[PDB]
Amino acid sequence: HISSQQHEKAIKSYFDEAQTQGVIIIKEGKNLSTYGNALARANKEYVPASTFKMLNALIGLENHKATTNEIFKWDGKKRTYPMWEKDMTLGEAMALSAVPVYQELARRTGLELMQKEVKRVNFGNTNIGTQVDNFWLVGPLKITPVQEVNFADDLAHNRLPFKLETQEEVKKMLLIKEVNGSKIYAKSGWGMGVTPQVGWLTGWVEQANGKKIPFSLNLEMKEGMSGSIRNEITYKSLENLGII
Ligand SMILES: *[B]([O])([O])[C][N]S(=O)(=O)[C]C1=[C][C]=[C]C(C([O])=O)=[C]1
């Protein structure tokens, strides 16, 4: 067995080498562990960015604003990324992190119902303000990494206050990787309309044996960083800890 000094040093080095600052929080049962090169980030608020898609989708499905097979049609207007210029389900929009689709869903839900559901879930600071289509991108909604891993822990275990079927539909949308009989469920986030920019990967490992290990990586993205650094640092960290 590797010392935890070694674990903490190895995981800190993954952040150091990506030349960023960040934290990965791992929950094992009820025990939270904080790793990385900027531990104090663990209890600081950031916009949830596209991590909010998880709750956005729970809210919309529970409230019959969409079904899992409905196709959100591209309206033909130029999008920020050409990959978004196509027709997609909530599932496909989740994988592509297609903001316009999740904005449409937010608009269907409406400000009033959205506010009620976010308070009911008590997600982050629970504050959505007045614009139903961008509160998760630029504020006022904010959340700590500890809160994000706890949200992930809830979803993984079907503990959120939504039907089981709602939760299962959403979890099916989040499978991003399989590694030696482990499945990684997670949602990326990248908040580019805040400064500094925040990057997220929040989810859980479902191990071969049934155990679900939640995690939230939170870091600072800067210009010319690749998105996949969030993934790379996560996988390296989970492997270093023998979680995958
Ligand atoms: B959300 O935070 O992922 C949306 N962020 S974005 O629209 O500013 C840029 C973007 C596009 C596609 C994928 C990502 C990502 O986070 O994986 C981000």
Numbering used by the authors: 32 to 275
Could you give the paper's own sentences about this structure?
In its complex with OXA-24/40, CR167 adopts a binding mode that is similar to that of the carbapenem doripenem and extends away from the intact Tyr112/Met223 bridge into a hydrophobic pocket composed of Met114, Tyr112, Met223, and Trp221, referred to as the R2 site. The centroid–centroid distance between the aryl rings of the inhibitor and Tyr112 is 5.6 Å, with an angle of 89° between the planes of the aryl rings. The O1 hydroxyl of the boronic acid is bound in the presumed oxyanion hole, whereas the O2 hydroxyl interacts with Ser128 and a water molecule present in the active site. In the OXA-24/40 complex, CR167 binds in the R2 region of the active site, forming an essential interaction with its carboxylate recognition residue Arg261, and resembles the carbapenem binding orientation observed in class D enzymes.
Herein, we describe the activity of CR167 against other β-lactamases in A. baumannii: the cefepime-hydrolysing class C extended-spectrum β-lactamase (ESAC) ADC-33 and the carbapenem-hydrolyzing OXA-24/40 (class D). The nucleophilic attack of the catalytic serine on the boron atom forms a tetrahedral adduct, which mimics the acylation (or deacylation) tetrahedral structure of the high-energy intermediate formed during β-lactam hydrolysis. The structures of OXA-24/40 and ADC-33 in complex with CR167 and select chiral analogues were obtained.
